[PDB]
Amino acid sequence: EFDITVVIPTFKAEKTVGQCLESVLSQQGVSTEIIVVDGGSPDATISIVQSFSSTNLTIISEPDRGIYDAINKGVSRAQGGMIGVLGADDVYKPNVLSVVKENASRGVEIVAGLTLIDGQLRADEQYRPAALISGIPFGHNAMFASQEAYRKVGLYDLAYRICADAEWVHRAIKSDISCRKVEQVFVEFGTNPEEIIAEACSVIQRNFPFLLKEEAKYLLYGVRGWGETSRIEQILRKYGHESVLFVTALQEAFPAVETAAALEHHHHH
Numbered sequence: 329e330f331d332i333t334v335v336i337p338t339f340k341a342e343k344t345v346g347q348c349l350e351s352v353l354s355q356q357g358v359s360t361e362i363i364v365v366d367g368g369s370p371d372a373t374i375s376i377v378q379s380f381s382s383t384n385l386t387i388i389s390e391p392d393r394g395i396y397d398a399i400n401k402g403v404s405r406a407q408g409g410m411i412g413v414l415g416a417d418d419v420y421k422p423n424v425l426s427v428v429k430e431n432a433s434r435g436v437e438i439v440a441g442l443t444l445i446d447g448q449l450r451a452d453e454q455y456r457p458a459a460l461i462s463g464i465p466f467g468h469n470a471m472f473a474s475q476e477a478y479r480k481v482g483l484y485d486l487a488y489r490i491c492a493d494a495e496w497v498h499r500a501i502k503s504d505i506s507c508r509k510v511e512q513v514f515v516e517f518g519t520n521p522e523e524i525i526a527e528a529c530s531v532i533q534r535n536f537p538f539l540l541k542e543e544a545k546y547l548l549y550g551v552r553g554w555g556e557t558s559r560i561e562q563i564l565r566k567y568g569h570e571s572v573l574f575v576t577a578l579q580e581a582f583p584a585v586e587t588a589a590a591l592e593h594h595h596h597h
């Protein structure tokens with residue numbers, strides 16, 4: 329097989345898909361498979377991809393139901409031990425694929441790096457319970473996951489057109505999938521905000537079904553620093569009895585509520 333599979337969903341990416349592919353082929357010291365999942369691009373996208381006649385590139389061009397449908401198709405076919413997803417507007421940094429192969433040899437099922445968004449580091453969060461009341465903790469395109477990890481967790485849920493990656497990672501956390509965060513930039517990155525938020529809140533309720541939508545939004549804003557946090561102790565007392573995982577998530581995310589978390593663990597778990 330291969331050390332790495334890179335799944336590249338494309339639709340009308342003719343402007344950048346050549347730079348994206350160059351950043352993958354420049355990776356040395358790893359056997360790499362590339363699976364381009366195109367949704368029927370009418371521009372030069374296929375003409376450009378076919379310029380990269382690497383004997384380890386696969387082109388899938390057929391109607392799909394959105395990016396995560398296209399991602400699902402590529403992950404399903406991936407024959408590499410570690411699988412990564414690279415948008416056509418993104419580029420891998422030098423040496424990242426060997427860094428992923430190195431950290432995977434120890435058995436870690438997920439290897440995640442840093443993300444450069446407009447020359448700024450994405451404000452990542454830790455892969456831990458506290459992620460479950462937030463969005464995706466690391467950049468999706470900076471994540472690599474083994475064949476086993478996908479086989480354990482499943483595919484991306486097409487009900488989420490934006491944050492299906494966050495939902496998958498939360499399922500990974502909840503499934504105790506091993507993760508090692510590498511403090512190196514893996515990718516340089518190239519949608520209505522309301523829709524982003526709506527999907528993030530729904531993903532959070534999927535971890536903790538007892539939360540009203542407003543309550544999930546308050547937690548997201550509290551963790552992301554977008555809103556206040558005075559009502560965290562209220563939320564904790566209201567639902568702490570439900571899940572030890574929920575109590576763990578809030579005390580990690582909001583260290584100010586530790587003494588209150590102690591009480592929930594004591595009276596309920």
Ligand SMILES: C[C@@H]1O[C@@H](O)[C@@H](O)[C@H](O[C@H]2O[C@H](C)[C@H](O)[C@H](O[C@@H]3O[C@H](CO)[C@@H](O)[C@H](O)[C@H]3O)[C@@H]2O)[C@@H]1O
Pocket residue numbers: 450463464466467468469490491492493494521524525528
């Ligand atoms: C509407 C908001 O505008 C800005 O404040 C932006 O920074 C916000 O993005 C942050 O919060 C949202 C929830 C995202 O989690 C975003 O991370 C990105 O979200 C995707 C969702 O799964 C991932 O595909 C992507 O790789 C990841 O970089 C960031 O944390 C928000 O848009």
Ligand SMILES: Nc1nc2c(ncn2[C@@H]2O[C@H](COP(=O)(O)O)[C@@H](O)[C@H]2O)c(=O)[nH]1
Pocket residue numbers: 336337338339340341365366367392393394395398399414415416417
């Ligand atoms: N296969 C497929 N790829 C898509 C679709 N929409 C966007 N993409 C690709 O997914 C990546 C995300 O870019 P975005 O459009 O989200 O900025 C890009 O590589 C883009 O070309 C789609 O409907 N189907």
